[PDB]
Amino acid sequence: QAEIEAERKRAREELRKQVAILAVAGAEKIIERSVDEAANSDIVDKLVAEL
Amino acid sequence: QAEIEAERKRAREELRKQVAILAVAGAEKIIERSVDEAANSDIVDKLVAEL
Amino acid sequence: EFITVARPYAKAAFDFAVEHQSVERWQDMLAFAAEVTKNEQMAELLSGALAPETLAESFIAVAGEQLDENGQNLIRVMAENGRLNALPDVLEQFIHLRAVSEATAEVDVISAAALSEQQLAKISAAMEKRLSRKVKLNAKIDKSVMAGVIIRAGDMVIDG
Amino acid sequence: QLNSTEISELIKQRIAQFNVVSEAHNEGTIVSVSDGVIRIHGLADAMQGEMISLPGNRYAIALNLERDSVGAVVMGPYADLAEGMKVKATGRILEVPVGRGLLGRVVNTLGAPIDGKGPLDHDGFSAVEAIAPGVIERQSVDQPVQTGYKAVDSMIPIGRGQRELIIGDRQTGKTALAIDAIINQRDSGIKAIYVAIGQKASTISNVVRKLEEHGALANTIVVVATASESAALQYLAPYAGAAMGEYFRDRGEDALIIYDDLSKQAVAYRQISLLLRRPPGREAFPGDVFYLHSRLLERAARVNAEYVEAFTKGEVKGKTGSLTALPIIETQAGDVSAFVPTNVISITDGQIFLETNLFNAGIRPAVNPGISVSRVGGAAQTKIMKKLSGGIRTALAQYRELAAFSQFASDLDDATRNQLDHGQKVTELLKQKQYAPMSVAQQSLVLFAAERGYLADVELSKIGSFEAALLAYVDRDHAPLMQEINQTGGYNDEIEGKLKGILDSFKATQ
Amino acid sequence: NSTEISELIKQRIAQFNVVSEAHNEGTIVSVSDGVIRIHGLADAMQGEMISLPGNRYAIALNLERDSVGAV
Amino acid sequence: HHHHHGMATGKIVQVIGAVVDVEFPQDAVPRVYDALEVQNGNERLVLEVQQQLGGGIVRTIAMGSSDGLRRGLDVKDLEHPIEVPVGKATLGRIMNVLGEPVDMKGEIGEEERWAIHRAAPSYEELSNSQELLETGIKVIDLMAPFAKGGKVGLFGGAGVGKTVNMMELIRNIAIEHSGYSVFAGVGERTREGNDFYHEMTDSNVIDKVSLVYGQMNEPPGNRLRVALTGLTMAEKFRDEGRDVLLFVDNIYRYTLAGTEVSALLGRMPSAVGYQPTLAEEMGVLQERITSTKTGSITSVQAVYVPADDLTDPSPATTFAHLDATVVLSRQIASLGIYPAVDPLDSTSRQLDPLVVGQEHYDTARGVQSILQRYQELKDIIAILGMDELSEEDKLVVARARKIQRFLSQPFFVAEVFTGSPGKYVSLKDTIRGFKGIMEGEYDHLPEQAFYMVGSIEEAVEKAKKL
Amino acid sequence: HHHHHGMATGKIVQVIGAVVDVEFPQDAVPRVYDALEVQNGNERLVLEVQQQLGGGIVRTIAMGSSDGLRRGLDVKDLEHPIEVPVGKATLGRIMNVLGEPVDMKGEIGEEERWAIHRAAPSYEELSNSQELLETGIKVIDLMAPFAKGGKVGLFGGAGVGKTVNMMELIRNIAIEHSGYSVFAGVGERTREGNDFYHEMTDSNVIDKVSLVYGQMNEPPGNRLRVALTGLTMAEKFRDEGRDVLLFVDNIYRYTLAGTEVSALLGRMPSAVGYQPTLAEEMGVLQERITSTKTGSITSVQAVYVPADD
């Protein structure tokens, strides 16, 4: 019963953490969608002049 | 087992409440790390306004 | 639509028939004879013939008739043997297979088809693709540079 | 509060990354996609069987690398894929974890993700296939075999290096029945495997719960396999589920390999071969049954010092790498008369056939009489179960042949009435029940009552509980040194004196 | 030049006005140990014996155009 | 799949029967089994494209026969999925096979936009557990227990008591357990539709129960395509909080319709007519005969197997999946009885001592020992002479006869079926009335007082009135 | 297995399965036994061309495998067809399936290197009288008059075994008649070789018999190609002054490999699950063990029937 309670608490606490999908989706969508601001001709030289 | 079910439910509810209370710190740290390390423009002008 | 029958027409005409200065007759005869029946008249009207002299002589000698021995012999042998019913890869197979001695074409850098004059590995692609001149075009050249770090960091770090 | 370590790994991994590729490199372009058979028109001049990953976590291998297009292998979802995703350049092929460090946890089809952890690392991520051992260096070690049956422990045992083709009967039972080997054998100390072929929730929950709660859990590997697998996990269970077995048999330790039923293995690969216009013969299979059984059934052999002195790269050259071939199968009421059954059962060493007539009628005898036999027999075990406990054919053939023909020929004499009480009482009272653990006390209790004359005085069915419990508890509790006789061979002064005094005092004082 | 014939592909695709295949001889297209296709043989009789390479009376199966099966 | 129109149009080159040479535009098709709703002649036919060779030119097949159109049909697919009308409030009406009216009544009461979402429970649920609820009966509930939402596959011939299963199971699967129920109406006709509609609608087997439909007049795809609508429409009511009940048609429709439809079409045929892919779906049956995280899809199977068999190929898989056997004949009802159910021929599979106990395993020993000892002792003495009657033969014609034969009772809601309605029994009546009153408790106990009693507990207490 | 002279040929084309469709030379194809030693991967995997075709892509079949090859593997031309190493000096160690060894080193006694395809049946100089033999026993020679250099069949179950026939025949027939009695083996177990070979240390026959067994871990072409070692190695001792006497194992490897390989190649053959090459191999191989003027060629016909079919 103690091993089942520890395994259920560890599986529920490790599987119920939505920081991976929430932080990855919010950080990836906000960082990938909010990168157009303040990026006129300065971001094209550092990403296109390195070839 | 019936006495351990309340401890397992209390531990799962405590983990869900701790993850929900920590979602602001995880979203803020993920937004600051993604905005400060997005490999594009180091500028935190656009607010993500995440949970 | 020859596929396997396209290697003989492109490989057999670029070696034995290349000594008679036939580098320009194959492009005009193959492009004109193969592209002249791409509509809805010469294909359905010439592909449903009974003999090979009417389809080969009419389709190869009635629509301009800009051929010689290779056009009449190749059109008669291909039309009588069964190869003139499509012939869609004659220009690409004959041009790419016949022009393999000086073929210089690169790839794309997640933008547009530049087609550099690089015959070997890392020939003119470094100077032509790194010596601007042109650095970024309007075909999503500079905007596609963050797909590797964004897709690799977001996809590889999306599991947590 | 919940992230903590996730900010350092996510910030470091997400901030470091690497570079940007995909420039002047042909990664393979798929022409069409017929739900699995993807014609990859590109990257055909690579390795023969390179499982290149396409769009997602897959392993598309070259099924037929011709001069132009080549078919891809389906690894999961392939019905929703279209013709436009192309593929990716990947040179890795057969990257599974091989080693003795993860032998014990619940393994899966391609790794160990079926358990609760998932981070069970091995020694090295190498190939999953296995080859045969040495031709002249296959020295079989005659060791004792103690599964869980009280009647099969001294009849025909298989130690190390033997291949016994077990045939499990349907309807109680082939998946379980005599599953008391892990609970009765305690710690096995070998690198045994348990490859499945179509499991469910009741088999994984009952087997994982009863295996860990009734016996040793971390002692043998278990390759789980679901029923929704095509041919890369269901048909490759016997050929790909022998990695850990190659970590102890080639070094100097002991290893084993056990598979599930032969219906899903031989029937799972028949649909991909016949559905792709390839070769066919016996049950939609040409020569695939003879090539897969050679590197699986005839590969688990006990190596000596020459075969393990060079494969271990300088480790335990003085030890002999033993490997037990536990090739079992689930016969559907005696469904073994094809090319794979006769070639696989006849190409090995032993062949144990069990019927459902003696087990599906309410008796405790699961094995048939005279149909289940191995190859080494009882001489490869201990000394007490070789020359003093090895007469199942005499009591079974004499009791069954002399007692079965009593309908029209009645009036039994002294030669026929003596085999009914000894054969029926010994065969009906000495047989193990369902999920019954059997230790090393079968040779001392079976080599004394069925040899001297202690079981002749109590041939009744009602006296078996009082005589067996009183004599076993009184003799086993009044003398603890007799158990030491089960620690080795025997058949000497201690066996005759301890068996005669314990059997006469325990049988006469009850 | 639909079929890969090297000599006959370039010669037939570049000069189809001169065939000259009425000598009832020529050579063979392939040889799969018995199943050999005799090329040409337009004026040859169907089923008649012919001495090929060595000492064997190779007789054709049928007269299906110029692709006769010699054994 | 494909809902509903768009993606430019198409042009059919060759027109045939079912599997024709369909060809759409250049890169304008969807995923697998995309039912493109195109105007094929007059009605809007939906041709599901199973293949995906290239883009547009794929093998499409409809639910019926498309033979009749000219060479030039405009086949246009879509981009979203085909959301069938299913939900949790669909019980009580008569739904069709595609989501419409069956007997000119109400259609689907709930529209949850179910796009063929086959719900299957994995290992992260309540698997596995046993149900064994009320019915109410004694030998049928204790001697033949069922799992939590398992597929209780029965087996019986002609005249095995059709009114006892629908009448006795119509009240326990709609008031005792969960109120949401469903019924399968595939493969019906005049006697099946009139007897099932009149008998199910005249009692208590219609509300609330989602009655499905389906005729086998056209191809076997529409009449045999009950996996998406059946597994997504009847099992969708278990997510509300309670369980969900459903029915089945026959076991020969899957093998006959799947083998004949998969073998009579050309493609997908290499196992001598048998389909090696659809049979793989049977491997998911273990994910449907158990309790999920929100409910339990109690799919009660019918009495159908391999040509009416009890120990064949399809009959052995249905009996081993449940906790009991499957045997029903006319020998129990031929000697004057109400419920046609065999007690000695339908034993429980989980009647051991490890997954039971003293009180749980005590009911099997009394019914098996009282039935075998009463039948063998009563038949041996009755087939010979009355002088060979000791205690079991002379005492098994009163206690074992009424206790072992008192299971033939009426239904729980037989107000217009069997006349009188029986009471609801539990598990204490079978163990308390069969674990002590079957060998000799009340001495004088005839079979007249236990012939109409709904429970066995009244077989020994109400014996004073006979 | 051929003598390469030039090492040219060409590239390849398709490599799907065991069908070696490599485009070597144009109008310079080899013979049937002349294999092309292609450099596929690391080793020189040779493929025997069973049927030559025009263009270059011929229908060839290899023994083992290519060990991971690309679509354009370089091949090599040969001159001498079937050039393996054998001779009469093979009686000393265990042989393999390609003229090499399986026990110790030395390639089972390296001596001569002629053609691996020996002659089947012939007359003229061969002994046409067909004389009788004598094993020197009361229940073998007095009850059955065997011929000198014949293929006598065997039946029954157990009882005698390989130790009685090998131990009793390796000393009485070796001293009573001048000749070297070898053996073979196609379709055996992987562990028996680690036990039965020990019998060679109990009768002193390892120095007078060439054990050529292929076990069963290989495929059909890699394990069923043991016919060149027995016919090529047994002809050097029977045509010099001694009398060769081979010993087969079973017929499951030749029947299953011949019927499955000959019927699973996309061509029709015999009926009842048989192939059309049984009369040529059985009739041509059964009549090759005959008496000659320089020595009788004997072979133990240990074929296994398919449960009395």
Ligand SMILES: Nc1ncnc2c1ncn2[C@@H]1O[C@H](COP(=O)(O)OP(=O)(O)OP(=O)(O)O)[C@@H](O)[C@H]1O
């Ligand atoms: N010889 C026996 N005597 C009594 N009970 C037995 C015997 N063998 C097995 N059993 C019972 O059978 C049960 C295990 O059945 P199992 O799951 O192996 O059936 P199965 O092999 O899945 O059947 P099928 O092959 O028809 O699918 C055990 O609980 C055990 O009690």
